[PDB]
Coordinates of C-alpha atoms and ligand atoms in Angstrom, one line a residue:
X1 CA -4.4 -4.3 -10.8
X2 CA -6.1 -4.5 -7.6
X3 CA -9.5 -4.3 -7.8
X4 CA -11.7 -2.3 -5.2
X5 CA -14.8 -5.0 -3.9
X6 CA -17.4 -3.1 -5.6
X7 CA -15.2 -2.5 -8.8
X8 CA -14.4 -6.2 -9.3
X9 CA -18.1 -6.7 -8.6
X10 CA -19.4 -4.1 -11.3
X11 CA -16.3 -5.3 -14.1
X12 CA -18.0 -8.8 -13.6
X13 CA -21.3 -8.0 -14.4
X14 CA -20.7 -5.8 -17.5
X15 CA -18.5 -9.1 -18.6
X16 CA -21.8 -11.2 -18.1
X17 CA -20.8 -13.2 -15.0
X18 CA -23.5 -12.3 -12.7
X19 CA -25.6 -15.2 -12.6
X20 CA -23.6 -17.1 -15.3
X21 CA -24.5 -21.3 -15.2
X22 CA -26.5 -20.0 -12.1
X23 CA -23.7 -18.6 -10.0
X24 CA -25.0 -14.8 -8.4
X25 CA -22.5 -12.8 -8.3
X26 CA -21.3 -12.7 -5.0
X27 CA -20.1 -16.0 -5.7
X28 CA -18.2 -14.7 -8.1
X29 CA -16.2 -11.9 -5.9
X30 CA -16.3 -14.2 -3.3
X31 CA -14.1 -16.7 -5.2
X32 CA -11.9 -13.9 -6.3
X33 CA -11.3 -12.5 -2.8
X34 CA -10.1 -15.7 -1.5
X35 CA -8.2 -16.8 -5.0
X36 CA -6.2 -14.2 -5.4
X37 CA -7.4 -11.1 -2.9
X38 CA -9.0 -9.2 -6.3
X39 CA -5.3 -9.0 -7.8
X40 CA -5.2 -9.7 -11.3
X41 CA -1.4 -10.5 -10.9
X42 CA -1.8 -13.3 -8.2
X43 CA 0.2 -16.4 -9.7
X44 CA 0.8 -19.6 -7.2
X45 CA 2.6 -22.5 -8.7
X46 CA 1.2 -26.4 -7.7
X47 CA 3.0 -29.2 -6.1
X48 CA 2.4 -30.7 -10.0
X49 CA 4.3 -28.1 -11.5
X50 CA 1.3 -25.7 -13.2
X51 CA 0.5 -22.6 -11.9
X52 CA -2.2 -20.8 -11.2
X53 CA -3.0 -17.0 -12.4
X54 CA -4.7 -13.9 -12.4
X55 CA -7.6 -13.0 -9.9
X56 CA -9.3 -16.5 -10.6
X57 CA -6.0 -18.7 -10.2
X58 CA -7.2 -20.4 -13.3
X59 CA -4.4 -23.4 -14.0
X60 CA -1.9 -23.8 -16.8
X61 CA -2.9 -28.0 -16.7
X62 CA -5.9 -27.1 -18.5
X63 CA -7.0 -23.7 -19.5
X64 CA -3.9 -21.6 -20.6
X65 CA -0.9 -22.0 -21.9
X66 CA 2.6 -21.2 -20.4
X67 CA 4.6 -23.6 -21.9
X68 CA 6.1 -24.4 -18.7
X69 CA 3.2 -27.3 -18.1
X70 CA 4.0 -30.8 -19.6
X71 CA 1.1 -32.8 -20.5
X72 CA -1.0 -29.7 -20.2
X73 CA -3.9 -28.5 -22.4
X74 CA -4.7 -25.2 -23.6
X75 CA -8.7 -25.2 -23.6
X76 CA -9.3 -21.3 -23.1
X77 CA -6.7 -20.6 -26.1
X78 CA -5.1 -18.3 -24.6
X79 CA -1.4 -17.5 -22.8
X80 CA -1.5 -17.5 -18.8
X81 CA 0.0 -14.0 -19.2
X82 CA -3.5 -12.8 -20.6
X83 CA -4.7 -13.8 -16.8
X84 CA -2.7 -11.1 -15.2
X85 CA -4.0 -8.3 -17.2
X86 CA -5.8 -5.3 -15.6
X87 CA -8.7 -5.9 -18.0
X88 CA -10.5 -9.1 -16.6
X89 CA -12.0 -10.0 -20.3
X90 CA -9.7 -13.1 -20.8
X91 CA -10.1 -14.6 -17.0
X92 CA -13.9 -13.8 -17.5
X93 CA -14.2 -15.5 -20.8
X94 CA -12.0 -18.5 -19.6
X95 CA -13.7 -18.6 -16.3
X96 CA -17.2 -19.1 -18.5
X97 CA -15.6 -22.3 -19.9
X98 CA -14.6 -23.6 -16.4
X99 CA -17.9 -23.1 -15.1
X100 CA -19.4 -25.0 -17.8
X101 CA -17.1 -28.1 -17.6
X102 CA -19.9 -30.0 -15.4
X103 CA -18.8 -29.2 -11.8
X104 CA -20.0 -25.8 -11.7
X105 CA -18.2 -23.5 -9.0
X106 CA -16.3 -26.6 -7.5
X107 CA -13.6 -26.2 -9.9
X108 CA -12.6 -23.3 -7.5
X109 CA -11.3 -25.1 -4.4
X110 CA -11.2 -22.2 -2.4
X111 CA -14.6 -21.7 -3.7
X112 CA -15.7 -25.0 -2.2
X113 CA -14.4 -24.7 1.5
X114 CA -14.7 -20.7 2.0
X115 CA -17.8 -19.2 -0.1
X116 CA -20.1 -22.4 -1.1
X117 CA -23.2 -22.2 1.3
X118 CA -22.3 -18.7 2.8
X119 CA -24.4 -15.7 2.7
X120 CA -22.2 -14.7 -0.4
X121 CA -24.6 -11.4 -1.3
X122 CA -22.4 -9.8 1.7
X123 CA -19.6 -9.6 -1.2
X124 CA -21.7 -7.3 -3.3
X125 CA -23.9 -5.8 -0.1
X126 CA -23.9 -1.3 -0.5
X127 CA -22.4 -1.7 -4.2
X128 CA -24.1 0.2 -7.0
X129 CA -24.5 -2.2 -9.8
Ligands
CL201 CL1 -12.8 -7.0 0.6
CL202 CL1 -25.0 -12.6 -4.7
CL203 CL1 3.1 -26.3 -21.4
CL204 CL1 -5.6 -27.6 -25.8
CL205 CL1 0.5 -19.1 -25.8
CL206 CL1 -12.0 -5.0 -16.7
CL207 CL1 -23.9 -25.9 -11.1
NA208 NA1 -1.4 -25.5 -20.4

């Protein structure tokens, strides 16, 4: 599924991520936009071999399992195939766990260089939420 702005914004918040460990939403969308363009079916595999999937490019070396990761752990209990799904409960869920690992949003990369800092309300500016 590929999520409109203001749906992805509105499926966030009824899964309790607007202003989850302090993060507003537009944090949130922002990191989805540039992550995987509000596709749940975005997968990018890593120089290491994981991958990364669903509209938060969580990573197989940690948080899912694909069985395709050596070393790996599975700390969200889940397969990476529940990441592509057009209902965003397991990313959500799994995402909540990231963002309480003790460096907040920075687990995100792409959150770090392109929405950390910015005016991120602009992602959920006009939406009725
Ligand atoms: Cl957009
Ligand atoms: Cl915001
Ligand atoms: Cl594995
Ligand atoms: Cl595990
Ligand atoms: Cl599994
Ligand atoms: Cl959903
Ligand atoms: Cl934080
Ligand atoms: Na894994």
């Amino acid at each position: 599924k590929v999520f409109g702005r203001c749906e992805l914004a509105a499926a966030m918040k009824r899964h309790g991520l607007d202003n989850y460990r302090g993060y507003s939403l537009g944090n949130w969308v922002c990191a989805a936009k540039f992550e995987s363009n509000f596709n749940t079916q975005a997968t990018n595999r890593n120089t290491d071999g994981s991958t990364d999937y669903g509209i938060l490019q969580i990573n197989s070396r940690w948080w899912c399992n694909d069985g395709r990761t050596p070393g790996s752990r599975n700390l969200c209990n889940i397969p990476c195939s529940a990441l592509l799904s057009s209902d965003i409960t397991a990313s959500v869920n799994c995402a909540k766990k990231i963002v309480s690992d003790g460096n907040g949003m920075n687990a995100w990369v792409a959150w770090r260089n392109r929405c950390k800092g910015t005016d991120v309300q602009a992602w959920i500016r006009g939406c009725r939420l």
